[PDB]
Amino acid sequence: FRKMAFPSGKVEGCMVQVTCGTTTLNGLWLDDVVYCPRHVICTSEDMLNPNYEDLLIRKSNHNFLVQAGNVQLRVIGHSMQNCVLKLRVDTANPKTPKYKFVRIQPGQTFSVLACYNGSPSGVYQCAMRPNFTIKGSFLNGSCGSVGFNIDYDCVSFCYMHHMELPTGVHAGTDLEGNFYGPFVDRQTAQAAGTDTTITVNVLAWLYAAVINGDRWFLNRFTTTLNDFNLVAMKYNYEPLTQDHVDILGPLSAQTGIAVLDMCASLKELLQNGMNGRTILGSALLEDEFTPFDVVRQCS
Amino acid sequence: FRKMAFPSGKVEGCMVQVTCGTTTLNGLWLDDVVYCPRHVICTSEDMLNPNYEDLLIRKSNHNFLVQAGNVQLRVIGHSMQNCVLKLRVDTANPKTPKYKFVRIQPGQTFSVLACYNGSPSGVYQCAMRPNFTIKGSFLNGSCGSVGFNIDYDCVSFCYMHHMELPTGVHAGTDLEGNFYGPFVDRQTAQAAGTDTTITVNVLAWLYAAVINGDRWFLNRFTTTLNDFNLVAMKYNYEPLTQDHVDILGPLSAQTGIAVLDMCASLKELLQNGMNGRTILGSALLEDEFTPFDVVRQCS
Ligand SMILES: *[C@H](O)[C@H](C[C@@H]1CCNC1=O)NC(=O)[C@H](CC(C)C)NC(=O)OCc1ccccc1
Ligand SMILES: *[C@H](O)[C@H](C[C@@H]1CCNC1=O)NC(=O)[C@H](CC(C)C)NC(=O)OCc1ccccc1
Numbered sequence: 366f367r368k369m370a371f372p373s374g375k376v377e378g379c380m381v382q383v384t385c386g387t388t389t390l391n392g393l394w395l396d397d398v399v400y401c402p403r404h405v406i407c408t409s410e411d412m413l414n415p416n417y418e419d420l421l422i423r424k425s426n427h428n429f430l431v432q433a434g435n436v437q438l439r440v441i442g443h444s445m446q447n448c449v450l451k452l453r454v455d456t457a458n459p460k461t462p463k464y465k466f467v468r469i470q471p472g473q474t475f476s477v478l479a480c481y482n483g484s485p486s487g488v489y490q491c492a493m494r495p496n497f498t499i500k501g502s503f504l505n506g507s508c509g510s511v512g513f514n515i516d517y518d519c520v521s522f523c524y525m526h527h528m529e530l531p532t533g534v535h536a537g538t539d540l541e542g543n544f545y546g547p548f549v550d551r552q553t554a555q556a557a558g559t560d561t562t563i564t565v566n567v568l569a570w571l572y573a574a575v576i577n578g579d580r581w582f583l584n585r586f587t588t589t590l591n592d593f594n595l596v597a598m599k600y601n602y603e604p605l606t607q608d609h610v611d612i613l614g615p616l617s618a619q620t621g622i623a624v625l626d627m628c629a630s631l632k633e634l635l636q637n638g639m640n641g642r643t644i645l646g647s648a649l650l651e652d653e654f655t656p657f658d659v660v661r662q663c664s
Numbered sequence: 665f666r667k668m669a670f671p672s673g674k675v676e677g678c679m680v681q682v683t684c685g686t687t688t689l690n691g692l693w694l695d696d697v698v699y700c701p702r703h704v705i706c707t708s709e710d711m712l713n714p715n716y717e718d719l720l721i722r723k724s725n726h727n728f729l730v731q732a733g734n735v736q737l738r739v740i741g742h743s744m745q746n747c748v749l750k751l752r753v754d755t756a757n758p759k760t761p762k763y764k765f766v767r768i769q770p771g772q773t774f775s776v777l778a779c780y781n782g783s784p785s786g787v788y789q790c791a792m793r794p795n796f797t798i799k800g801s802f803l804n805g806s807c808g809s810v811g812f813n814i815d816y817d818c819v820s821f822c823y824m825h826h827m828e829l830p831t832g833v834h835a836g837t838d839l840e841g842n843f844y845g846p847f848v849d850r851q852t853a854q855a856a857g858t859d860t861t862i863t864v865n866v867l868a869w870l871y872a873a874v875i876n877g878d879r880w881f882l883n884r885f886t887t888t889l890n891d892f893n894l895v896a897m898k899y900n901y902e903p904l905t906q907d908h909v910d911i912l913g914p915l916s917a918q919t920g921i922a923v924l925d926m927c928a929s930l931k932e933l934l935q936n937g938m939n940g941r942t943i944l945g946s947a948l949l950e951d952e953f954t955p956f957d958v959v960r961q962c963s
Pocket of ligand 2: 703711808829834849
């Protein structure tokens with residue numbers, strides 16, 4: 366089982382660069398609007414406690430340099446929506462895919478197209494942690510890189526990159542500019558809160574093991590969802606939601622193992638350990654594969 | 665620090681579907697030629713023991729159905745080059761990138777664009793194992809998917825997919841149709857030679873772990889090159905050459921850790937084990953990052 370990104374071409378055709386003064390970052394060109402992090406309007410010294418409303422008052426359309434490659438797109442309007450800037454340009458992007466803006470939940474995975482100066486550099490899968498950080502690979506100039514899922518040629522944009530935390534993990538917004546987690550776009554000392562293991566994804570991984578014939582851990586017990594959630598939190602595991610139970614439906618139907626029966630198997634794993642045995646060749650339980658990821662890879 | 669693939673857009677625009685009789689796989693459409701695995705011409709009975717030159721002489725241009733999205737391309741000629749078929753079509757692919765065909769060396773990495781029915785499905789990074797298999801993620805209908813590297817917008821195609829071994833690893837050819845490894849495109853269970861670990865890549869990855877604030881595995885010892893290689897061979901690691909030591913030069917200068925000092929670190933890791941500790945979140949020593957891969961991502 367491997368981390369597989371979505372093909373990135375539909376998003377590559379949407380990446381541009383946005384410069385204000387000497388600060389350049391990336392933007393997302395869809396139809397006639399370019400979306401980018403609002404801190405592009407900041408001077409390096411204005412990043413500690415910026416007054417974005419005041420900094421933007423001093424900006425006009427002609428202060429924004431938007432480029433597809435080296436080709437300038439003329440800006441004809443600007444506005445700020447939460448933590449993102451929306452620059453209306455005079456050209457509709459002919460490579461605009463069918464798309465949606467979606468806000469994802471902790472545990473969901475997405476592909477990141479890492480970009481610098483509007484030029485895509487690499488693509489990789491990330492999972493949103495329960496503390497609303499991601500373990501990205503981002504360098505200076507990566508802001509405005511986006512995360513996405515693709516379903517039947519419709520690109521669902523879910524993440525735009527804004528910052529690195531001192532622990533070296535990353536934080537950002539949805540495409541309406543609302544941060545995931547309790548972070549703000551100021552170059553201040555912020556810290557990721559204590560993280561937890563993504564229970565729904567561990568369960569998805571156990572189903573993947575069962576699908577492939579590795580099922581020693583299937584026990585004879587069951588549990589209630591509430592009883593499981595209370596024990597799981599004693600082990601730094603996330604509690605399950607009703608939505609988690611439902612997204613495990615397909616894998617549960619495929620294997621014939623009830624979701625609550627699998628929870629009881631996981632609970633036993635937590636209370637006694639793996640006892641020197643592996644699952645899918647690994648001694649660690651993997652929590653960055655969603656139920657969709659498991660089915661997507663197997664079909 | 666993550667396993668990161670190249671952006672796949674330049675390759676996506678080249679993928680097509682190729683059908684012959686009941687057999688469907690993917691092709692690579694560059695200019696006016698479509699490249700695909702030659703076993704597309706085999707029925708299920710032919711797959712067991714095919715005489716490809718005999719099977720091919722009996723095919724006509726119209727036995728080949730090539731589809732690029734919804735439009736059908738007309739095959740106007742066809743030839744076989746080793747294990748690859750070259751179908752000449754009456755349309756030039758307007759999305760053909762600047763490209764080269766290259767044969768990669770064991771230990772080098774590349775990105776795979778997994779495709780089904782001519783449609784790209786996922787992208788991920790692979791390494792050519794020393795035994796000339798790759799540890800991929802490929803299902804029925806993935807043949808003709810390609811591996812590649814991208815430099816300054818020039819796509820270097822290095823791999824085309826043909827088969828899965830009983831152990832679950834994968835085998836294929838360069839774009840000239842020559843297999844990597846002692847494998848043949850016949851429907852028989854084939855074993856690979858004993859695999860070995862790519863030493864220069866493990867060392868590059870340890871240096872990446874230091875660039876990301878992890879040093880628990882470092883020690884005060886040092887070792888000679890020959891003494892290290894005696895231990896490496898004992899653990900089924902590939903020899904480390906002076907060319908390798910030189911290629912690791914930049915990473916050693918960045919961290920101030922001499923190559924042979926890091927070799928003493930790896931020797932201790934190999935002789936003592938990892939003690940249930942982890943490096944970059946991994947419980948095993950990772951060998952599918954090249955020194956170039958580490959530098960590109962880390963800088
Ligand atoms: C966006 O281009 C950039 C991405 C960072 C750069 C290095 N790796 C990254 O992920 N974002 C920032 O530089 C961001 C800007 C703020 C307005 C949000 N600042 C940031 O990430 O700061 C890190 C930091 C904060 C406080 C002290 C020291 C470093
Ligand atoms: C091409 O689409 C396909 C890809 C395989 C299918 C499953 N995963 C893959 O990667 N290739 C084949 O089906 C290939 C066709 C031969 C003519 C080369 N056969 C194959 O992979 O068979 C493997 C095998 C044969 C006999 C015993 C055990 C394994």
